[PDB]
Specification:
Number of domains: 3
CATH class of the largest domain: Mainly Beta
Largest sheet: 7 strands, mixed
CATH architecture of the largest domain: Sandwich
Distance between the termini: 78 Å
Structural class: alpha+beta
Bound molecules: ligand A1BEL, chloride ion, zinc ion
Number of helices: 9
CATH topology of the largest domain: Jelly Rolls
Strand order of the largest sheet: 10-13-18-14-15-16-17
Order of helices and strands: EEHEEEHHEEHHHHEEHEHEEEEEEEEE
Number of strands: 19
Helix content: 25-40%
Shape: elongated
Strand content: 25-35%
């Protein structure tokens, strides 16, 4: 008979006494140790005092599980623990003062998202996400990467899109303050104004240039081709996306960007960031140049309060 600690958040620890003849799953339900499914294993003696994650099976654990993760999905813990088993074996080197990921298990898109998050202002709503976000900025990003996979319903090895991953993550962040007022002008229908809030205020799909979005873009009207342009923008950042195309990035005009080379889904991501010069982060590899032209699909810009001067 050894004594262990059960938890769902690694904050509120619940003390439990176990028998070494019954498997952990027989006594606690699905039980994990550092991501490893210990349901069908029996209590060994090094397990004394260690803390185990358990699937919630009473109301106290169910409430604590939501407080930390903001989900009642019973599959979340297993998908989280399954991803953590891999991500804690990845390497997280510091590259140009940023935490990256050494290439493994098709994690190129995760590294790009991880690098981008360290350069934009964002507060996550689930304490689980915010706490691991902090530890990731400090170099320990294994837990943060596993959570990203779980929250995106993706598995280790699956092929991932950075824009899609950021969008999922943005929906779990406090972007209530973010506002985007747009104006569409049609030669016949007229002129109409719509205001966006939250995730749609900080993302646009169609062009990489924030300036071009300010000047206006050609979009079809409900009558059949108008023009939409940005009127007001109140967000700490914006994300501009377009299907991969050749694009020139100039030092000091953007924060960071996603480079995508190769076939749809089968390709590989690289990360470009603007510092004193242009830097390219490819997992553990770093290169720098003063100019850059290449296939870009996301560009991130800084923002605070913008109001247009078009009459
Ligand atoms: C790497 C990757 C993983 C997954 C993925 O999809 C997953 C699907 C998609 C829908 C929901 N999910 C389950 C996509 C890509 C991808 O290769 N992503 C790269 C940037 C990519 C994006 C787009 C695109 C996005 N929106 N639109 C209008 C066009 N077109 C591309 C054309 C050629 C080459 C790359 C393109
Ligand atoms: Cl409940
Ligand atoms: Cl209940
Ligand atoms: Cl959620
Ligand atoms: Cl890769
Ligand atoms: Cl979701
Ligand atoms: Zn309840
Ligand atoms: Zn792995
Ligand atoms: Zn969710
Ligand atoms: Zn019209
Ligand atoms: Zn890849």
């Amino acid at each position: 008979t050894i004594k262990v600690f059960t938890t769902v958040d690694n904050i509120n620890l619940h003390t439990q006494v176990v028998d070494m003849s019954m498997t952990y799953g027989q006594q606690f339900g699905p039980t994990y140790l550092d991501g490893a499914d210990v349901t069908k294993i029996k209590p060994h003696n090094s397990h004394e005092g260690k803390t185990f994650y358990v699937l919630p099976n009473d109301d106290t654990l169910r409430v604590e599980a939501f407080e930390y993760y903001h989900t009642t999905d019973p599959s979340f813990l297993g998908r989280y623990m399954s991803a953590l088993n891999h991500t804690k074996k990845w390497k997280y080197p510091q590259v140009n003062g940023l935490t990256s990921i050494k290439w493994a298990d098709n994690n190129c898109y995760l590294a790009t998202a991880l690098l981008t998050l360290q350069q934009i202002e964002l507060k996550f709503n689930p304490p689980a996400l915010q706490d691991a976000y902090y530890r990731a900025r400090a170099g320990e990003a294994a837990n943060f990467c596993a959570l990203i996979l779980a929250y995106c319903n993706k598995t280790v090895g699956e092929l991932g899109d950075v824009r899609e991953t950021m969008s999922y993550l943005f929906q779990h962040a406090n972007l209530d303050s973010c506002k985007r007022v747009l104006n569409v002008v049609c030669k016949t229908c007229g002129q109409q104004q719509t205001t966006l809030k939250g995730v749609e205020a900080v993302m646009y799909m169609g062009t990489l240039s924030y300036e071009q979005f300010k000047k206006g873009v050609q979009i079809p009207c409900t009558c059949g081709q108008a023009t939409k342009y940005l009127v007001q923008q109140e967000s700490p950042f914006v994300m501009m996306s377009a299907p991969p195309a050749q694009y020139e990035l100039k030092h000091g005009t953007f924060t960071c960007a996603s480079e995508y080379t190769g076939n749809y889904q089968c390709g590989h991501y690289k990360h470009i960031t603007s510092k004193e010069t242009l830097y390219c982060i490819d997992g553990a590899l770093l290169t720098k140049s003063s100019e850059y032209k290449g296939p870009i699909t996301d560009v991130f810009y800084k923002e605070n309060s913008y109001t247009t001067t078009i009459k």
